Amino acid sequence: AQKTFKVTADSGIHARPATVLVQTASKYDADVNLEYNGKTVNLKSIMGVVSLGIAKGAEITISASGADENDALNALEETMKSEGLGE
After folding, report:
1. Which of 16, 32, 70, 87 has the fewest C-beta atoms under 10 angstroms from its C-beta?
2. Where do the domains of the chain lie?
3. What positions carry a catalytic annotation?
4. Phi and psi based region of residue 37 (left: phi greater than 0; alpha: psi -120 to 50; beta: remaining)
5. How far is CA 2 from CA 15, 62, 75, 76, 83, in A?
6. Is 71 exposed, middle or buried (0-12, 13-18, 19+ CB in 10 A)?
């Protein structure tokens, strides 16, 4: 269970988008983590994503590993298409 998302947001993946994601994966008990700059941070880490400082024109690798790992990856996906944080 995992999917590569494209980062094309203007602000990037800072705290604002890190709070929208931590809320989605939060409902899922699966351990979904994002990948950026060779650093895998837990999707439930708003302060940990700030250290990455993602911006527009970048790539990220997500991977759900737990019980409903498949339900979590598609959950954050529809959230990225609702506002337009990545595809």
Report:
1. 87
2. 1-87
3. 14
4. left
5. 22, 5, 12, 11, 21
6. middle
